[PDB]
Symmetry: C2
Subunit: 768 residues, 2 copies
Amino acid sequence: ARWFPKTLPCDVTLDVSKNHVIVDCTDKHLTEIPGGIPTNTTNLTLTINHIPDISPASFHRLVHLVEIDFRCNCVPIRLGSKSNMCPRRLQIKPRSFSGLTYLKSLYLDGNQLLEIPQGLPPSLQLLSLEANNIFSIRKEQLTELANIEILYLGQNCYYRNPCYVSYSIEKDAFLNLTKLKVLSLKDNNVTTVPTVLPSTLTELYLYNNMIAEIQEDDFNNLNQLQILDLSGNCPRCYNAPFPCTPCKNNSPLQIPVNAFDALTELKVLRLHSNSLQHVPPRWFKNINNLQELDLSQNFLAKEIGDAKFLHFLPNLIQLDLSFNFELQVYRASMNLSQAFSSLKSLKILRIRGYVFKELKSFQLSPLHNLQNLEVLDLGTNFIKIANLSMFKQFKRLKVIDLSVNKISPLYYFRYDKYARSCSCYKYGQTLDLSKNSIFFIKSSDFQHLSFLKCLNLSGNLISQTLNGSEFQPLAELRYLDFSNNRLDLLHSTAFEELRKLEVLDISSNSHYFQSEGITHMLNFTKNLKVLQKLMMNDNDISSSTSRTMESESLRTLEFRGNHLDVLWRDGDNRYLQLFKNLLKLEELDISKNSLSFLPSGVFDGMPPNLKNLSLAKNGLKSFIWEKLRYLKNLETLDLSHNQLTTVPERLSNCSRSLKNLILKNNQIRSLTKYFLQDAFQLRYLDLSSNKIQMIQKTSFPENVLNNLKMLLLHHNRFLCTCDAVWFVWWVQHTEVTIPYLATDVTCVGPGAHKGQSVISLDLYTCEL
Amino acid sequence: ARWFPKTLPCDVTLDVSKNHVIVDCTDKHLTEIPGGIPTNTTNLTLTINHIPDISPASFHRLVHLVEIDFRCNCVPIRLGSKSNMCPRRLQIKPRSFSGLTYLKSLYLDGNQLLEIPQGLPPSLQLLSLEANNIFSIRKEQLTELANIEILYLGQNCYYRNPCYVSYSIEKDAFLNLTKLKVLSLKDNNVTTVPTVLPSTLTELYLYNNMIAEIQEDDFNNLNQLQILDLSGNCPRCYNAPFPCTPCKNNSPLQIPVNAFDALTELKVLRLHSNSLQHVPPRWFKNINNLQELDLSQNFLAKEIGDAKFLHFLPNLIQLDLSFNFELQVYRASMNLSQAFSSLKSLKILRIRGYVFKELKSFQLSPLHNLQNLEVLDLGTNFIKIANLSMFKQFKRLKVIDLSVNKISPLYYFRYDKYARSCSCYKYGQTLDLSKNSIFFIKSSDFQHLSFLKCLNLSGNLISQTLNGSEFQPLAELRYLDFSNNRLDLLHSTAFEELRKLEVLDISSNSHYFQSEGITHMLNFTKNLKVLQKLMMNDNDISSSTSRTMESESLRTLEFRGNHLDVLWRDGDNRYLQLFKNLLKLEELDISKNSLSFLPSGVFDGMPPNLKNLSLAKNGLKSFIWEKLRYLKNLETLDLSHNQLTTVPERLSNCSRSLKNLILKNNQIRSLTKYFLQDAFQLRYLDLSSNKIQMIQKTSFPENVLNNLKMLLLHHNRFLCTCDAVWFVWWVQHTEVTIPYLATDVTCVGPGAHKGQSVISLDLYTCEL
Ligand SMILES: *[C@@H]1O[C@H](CO)[C@@H](O[C@@H]2O[C@H](CO)[C@@H](O[C@@H]3O[C@H](CO)[C@@H](O)[C@H](O)[C@@H]3O)[C@H](O)[C@H]2NC(C)=O)[C@H](O)[C@H]1NC(C)=O
Ligand SMILES: CCC[C@@H](CCO)Nc1nc(N)nc2cnn(Cc3ncc(C4CCN(C5CCOCC5)CC4)cc3OC)c12
Ligand SMILES: CCC[C@@H](CCO)Nc1nc(N)nc2cnn(Cc3ncc(C4CCN(C5CCOCC5)CC4)cc3OC)c12
Ligand SMILES: *[C@@H]1O[C@H](CO)[C@@H](O[C@@H]2O[C@H](CO)[C@@H](O)[C@H](O)[C@H]2NC(C)=O)[C@H](O)[C@H]1NC(C)=O
Ligand SMILES: *[C@@H]1O[C@H](CO)[C@@H](O[C@@H]2O[C@H](CO)[C@@H](O)[C@H](O)[C@H]2NC(C)=O)[C@H](O)[C@H]1NC(C)=O
Ligand SMILES: *[C@@H]1O[C@H](CO)[C@@H](O[C@@H]2O[C@H](CO)[C@@H](O)[C@H](O)[C@H]2NC(C)=O)[C@H](O)[C@H]1NC(C)=O
Ligand SMILES: *[C@@H]1O[C@H](CO)[C@@H](O)[C@H](O)[C@H]1NC(C)=O
Ligand SMILES: *[C@@H]1O[C@H](CO)[C@@H](O)[C@H](O)[C@H]1NC(C)=O
Ligand SMILES: *[C@@H]1O[C@H](CO)[C@@H](O)[C@H](O)[C@H]1NC(C)=O
Ligand SMILES: *[C@@H]1O[C@H](CO)[C@@H](O)[C@H](O)[C@H]1NC(C)=O
Ligand SMILES: *[C@@H]1O[C@H](CO)[C@@H](O)[C@H](O)[C@H]1NC(C)=O
Ligand SMILES: *[C@@H]1O[C@H](CO)[C@@H](O)[C@H](O)[C@H]1NC(C)=O
Ligand SMILES: *[C@@H]1O[C@H](CO)[C@@H](O)[C@H](O)[C@H]1NC(C)=O
Ligand SMILES: *[C@@H]1O[C@H](CO)[C@@H](O)[C@H](O)[C@H]1NC(C)=O
Ligand SMILES: *[C@@H]1O[C@H](CO)[C@@H](O)[C@H](O)[C@H]1NC(C)=O
Ligand SMILES: *[C@@H]1O[C@H](CO)[C@@H](O)[C@H](O)[C@H]1NC(C)=O
Ligand SMILES: *[C@@H]1O[C@H](CO)[C@@H](O)[C@H](O)[C@H]1NC(C)=O
Ligand SMILES: *[C@@H]1O[C@H](CO)[C@@H](O)[C@H](O)[C@H]1NC(C)=O
Ligand SMILES: *[C@@H]1O[C@H](CO)[C@@H](O)[C@H](O)[C@H]1NC(C)=O
Ligand SMILES: *[C@@H]1O[C@H](CO)[C@@H](O)[C@H](O)[C@H]1NC(C)=O
């Protein structure tokens, strides 16, 4: 179909709507900028490569460039790879970017640059220089950036990329940048807030620095500021998973009471990890539109009980007061101030790491009349006693998170959560009791909680024989996550009281299935009349008392990580019809079941409307492809990560309906003579990570290839001799999507073509 | 330096003491018996091969053969592999074994033979024909076996190898075999006990058959019988993991009261899975020397309460009454008859699967004065309540097994446990409480059990902050298995009360290490003054409050399955000396820790007496070999299953003490010019499963190679051209142990030599 093959090692996407010709060369092991890049290229990306220098020859013909994303070409030694370390820093010669008069964005992050690149065009609106060795900002170096709007200079002096000296900023360095909206000097060893900053700033990030005190003048002219982040200045270092140095004498970040007076348009204020002991109400005197306030990782345990500053925050949407506990005090109860009732517009409230022994209904009374409250997160508190019926006065809430607690009958601790690199809530009211010490359950525990749509009891100590009476009040429940427990299916009436249950997860409940002679009733699904999805993964199921699983509604069953090779032992025909009576079953995942072979009767004993079947990671050494005729509605068949050596003689003769066939990571050395002859329903074929040497025209007919949405042939043992004249010509001139063509579709031999891509091959010698 | 290379594909071991020249060809993918087998061969083994026939040419010149082990050459379709199924049964032509006048043993198991091979020598003492299609025994066919002593004919007609008809045995078929000591007709569809059997029988096995009734005459002349096994005749099929057909009307195996009268020398009687409801005392009237009695998988729950037959068994050593529960009764208590006190010589008593709610001290009173009692196993009983202090009257016992129970504050079910294929008890008194519902522990729980030397609390629900007061009475404890629990190391005083503790297993206690911000005190080892081995595997440890683990006695630490890549994050120098203060540490396993690279300071921060270190399954892309100089007492270094591409330039310049280096399963394509030059201390090197093409004398000097105990070079990409002239010659003429030489040390190329072994290569063309 194509007259000229695309030999460039980059993915070229055209977007005529926004007029962008995008060339993506991300992680293509390039030591030079490749030749033949389109002249109309607007967005050129060369991220994760080993190009040692940039010169006027680099973007000589690409005058229409609007963005250059030249990131991580010489990433610092500690942040980057150790197998392929950068020998020398990126060298930018003069007049490299001056000729590109249309350049709006330029990312030169992770390149070990010592200074700000000079000679940049006046049309540049965004400049990113993160993870470099630029630790001294001078006014003369910023003169070229007259029209810059976004400027990232962070991660230039911190534990992962040290500079061994304090960050220096000349007085009024950013002042004459009259269009600067976003400025970020995060993770830089900055000692004072740089002044005078331009009034047009909308976002300012000075987090994870050595700023010990804020002056009252530091933000006197930032009347258009929306986001301010002064986190990690005098940090709370208890259990920090990174080198953490707190301020001397355990003092907090000293912020004057009138420091935020000029910030009338402030929406987000992040004071995370600042060792604050008090929050003065005077801070929020002129801040009426504050929507997000993060006060996590401070010493505000006593302040949570008084918190007079909450009366000055009626438009606050998000409030975070996590990990504020007194280092050596295990409180008896949580004391929330009555001022929390004045937070009329609050939707999310997170108070993790408060650390208290007992939660009571009256302790959450300041939160009763907060009509817009959606999320109440009291996780990681080590709560031992909590009457779950107290949440009957919180029916309007979407999520009630009590995860990681001791109730019985990396986000807040990571150094930089916005670091740049080179679920059942949709069902309704969720009550998360995951990672808890609940060992026994009864109907009275879930009393007055009939409104719940999802209950996550994952990671608990429940080692009970459920008989259909432990969740009687949970009538509206649609999702129950019972994973990482010790479910004992002695009675087939387990879970029957949950009549509106659509999804049940009983994965990683292997305990009773590991010991011999224990009764297991897998026929418990018959009583659940509206169950759509069931997961019983990693349960090590090798035996069952019941021979059949019945259900008139189940559409998806995940039986991964079990021992169906033991149940379907050759000669034992008892469990071959285990999934047959699941009449509406469309998806069955029976991967990771040690099935070296499939006995006769497994295909006949499959349900009638089965569409997607996965036999992946089983170690299958043989497969009777002709047996796929029994599976009349088969669309997807996943046989990845197996030891299969051959493909069927004629795939169309094995299955009339098969659309998607995944054979990746197998021992296939050759395809049959007429493999895809008349396979008209086939739309996707994966033969990657195999040992295929030759592919002929008869095996891949054109009428079948043209209907394919994608064909994967990468990581194969292709021999590129004159016998492979058809395959090399077809691959080069086809319009079929074949991923990784110019990076992992390689000739293993003969001699000269070893390690060469098939897309850049020229077999003119085979026709003289 | 051998003069003639050993090209035979079998391991030839010489034993001049017993004149045995052993030739082992087990699993060598042979389609013919290989040529050049030594003439003095006594023991020839050809197990797991595809040799289609045996003829007089097979053992023509091997006249000194005392044993032929020709097993699993045509294994039945259901028992064997499906990728390489046998096309036709093994064909034995006439006069194949008649010429071998010294043949004493002949195993022809798993070959689909239809009849007993005829023309065998008169010197044969053992003949095994298991897993074949011989289901009709005639007297004329056993004429040739006049001097046979051992004869296995089982597994010829069962679910894994059916015959579709009952097993037929002619009357007095084995009677004239006047030397027959062992006879086994197990798993054969046998309907009646064959009569008259020869009086010289010492062992008889008729288990897993259709014998519904025993006649009083069946064993009237077996006065020399020691072992009798009539198990699996009228079996108990509840939760059987194999096709199980019980006798009609739930009737047991009908055994007359005087059936065992002539068995005066009987030592072992196995009546497992016979659906017995009563055990008449009259059975053991003339059996005074019975030592083992297996009555498991029967319906003897009520009989355990009366058991008058135990008065006729004073010399019984082992008694098994497991899985005798009434299918639908959960008893309140265990009722053991007072007749158990008359078992003076009993050492092992197993009563698993009795199924009862509460164990009380007085219920075990019949076992108080049994002075020789060593093992009391009451596992798989679902016991909910049991005062552990009751075992104070059982100090003499070696093991008290209460595994798989509900106590809170494949052997019995496999078809044939003797099927032929093609721990802390040494410390002292063990109390096994594994796989139980114990969620909380205190000193009073282990009161009066100071005598215990090992306590296995593995697989329990303990989610407690141990502070050194939960095991105060356990003063003599040397081993504590606390694996598969939820250990919370809040206090560094955990386990300190166990002062004589030598081994501590806290593996698979990942729960609290998975959630952020939780305090973890790994320095708890300092208080344990005699701890020799500590295992903290699969705990997902990514953070720690303490920076150093201290111990003046710990010799072995297993830290597998953790996140040392997170603790030793580049730039974070805080946990690099975590294992340094473990001064007597000789073994450290830090495999499976996601360590793609080792930061600088890990080697310097290692303990001084570290002998063996494992960095296996880490995904290591690079390794600074020169850093091994810090580890001055290093003998073993295991870097298996990693992504290392190169070996050091000079291994001698890296380590002066390294004896064993394991580099299996890596991406090494070539060795450095002078790799093992002057590395005289090396005694073991593994370079198997790598991509090495060439090995020259400069990289592998002979003075260093000759001192090696073993050198593994299998599964490599060896190119066998004239440049590899030295490697092929050395490998052919060396006495150094290289395993898998004539099976997996193969030439990948060029053309002609593809798939050929290097041992059978002839490079005479490279020297003309
Ligand atoms: C962040 O900036 C501070 C400076 O504001 C850096 O601190 C300084 O770091 C250097 C190098 O580690 C220290 O110098 C050394 O001092 C020792 C002890 O006197 C001496 O033996 C060495 O030869 C060397 O001179 C210096 O004392 C230290 N100053 C202070 C006040 O701490 C810090 O390294 C920077 N961190 C990062 C990650 O960039
Ligand atoms: C080795 C034991 C294997 C298995 C055997 C179960 O058949 N037992 C068990 N299997 C599993 N997975 N968990 C447990 C927990 N405890 N038990 C013992 C047990 N608990 C209850 C009964 C009921 C007794 C009363 N019965 C009736 C009640 C009235 O309407 C008719 C049934 C229901 C079972 C019988 C019983 O054992 C005999 C278990
Ligand atoms: C997110 C919480 C992380 C961590 C914080 C503590 O490291 N807490 C915890 N870490 C871990 N692994 N487990 C648990 C279980 N409960 N808690 C809460 C808790 N329990 C006890 C105390 C004692 C209070 C009294 N104190 C005494 C010591 C001696 O001088 C007198 C006071 C000992 C600790 C303090 C405390 O939290 C403040 C845990
Ligand atoms: C090509 O470069 C332009 C200019 O940098 C990118 O434009 C940004 O697009 C996003 C999404 O529409 C906007 O939010 C930004 O405001 C745009 N930036 C500027 C400076 O206009 C564009 O995304 C790039 N194309 C691709 C595919 O990455
Ligand atoms: C070689 O064959 C002889 C004869 O079958 C084997 O001898 C048996 O050895 C075991 C101990 O290993 C004794 O218990 C048997 O009584 C011996 N049988 C006979 C008939 O004497 C010998 O083990 C074989 N050698 C090897 C290495 O397998
Ligand atoms: C065990 O022997 C019995 C006969 O004693 C076999 O039973 C017959 O099997 C055939 C084939 O399935 C049936 O047509 C007969 O009706 C069966 N007869 C009876 C009485 O059951 C049985 O198949 C044999 N089993 C094995 C595993 O060899
Ligand atoms: C809550 O804390 C305040 C101090 O911040 C204290 O005065 C008050 O008594 C506390 N409330 C309760 C119920 O303990
Ligand atoms: C739990 O709280 C409910 C009221 O919400 C009450 O009826 C019930 O008795 C309480 N249960 C316990 C065990 O305190
Ligand atoms: C339950 O919580 C666990 C974490 O504790 C999480 O992995 C899982 O996805 C949750 N369940 C649902 C349905 O979201
Ligand atoms: C269900 O189990 C509970 C708790 O053991 C019990 O009270 C109840 O009677 C049981 N109901 C049935 C029908 O088995
Ligand atoms: C499950 O199977 C058992 C027999 O093994 C039967 O008694 C029980 O009624 C079955 N349960 C259902 C829901 O079909
Ligand atoms: C087919 O089912 C598999 C699971 O077996 C799933 O991962 C895949 O997304 C499904 N594809 C379609 C098109 O439904
Ligand atoms: C398979 O192909 C053969 C030969 O054309 C034909 O006889 C047979 O009916 C086909 N079966 C199916 C299911 O297509
Ligand atoms: C033990 O069982 C016998 C019947 O076998 C019965 O007579 C006796 O009362 C039982 N003992 C107890 C304590 O229940
Ligand atoms: C456990 O038994 C001992 C006697 O061996 C007794 O002193 C103790 O009180 C008992 N404890 C309980 C909880 O029954
Ligand atoms: C404890 O029991 C488990 C099985 O429940 C076993 O794997 C482990 O080896 C036992 N511990 C010891 C020290 O033998
Ligand atoms: C140890 O913990 C127990 C509770 O398990 C407590 O009674 C005791 O006072 C504690 N001792 C110390 C020294 O902390
Ligand atoms: C463990 O370290 C903590 C500080 O992190 C210290 O308080 C405690 O004494 C240490 N324990 C031991 C046994 O060294
Ligand atoms: C590992 O070290 C132990 C001593 O701690 C030693 O006995 C053992 O032989 C070593 N393993 C190997 C493979 O050398
Ligand atoms: C050992 O290696 C170091 C580092 O490459 C090198 O400087 C030194 O010369 C080597 N030792 C010898 C004896 O060559």
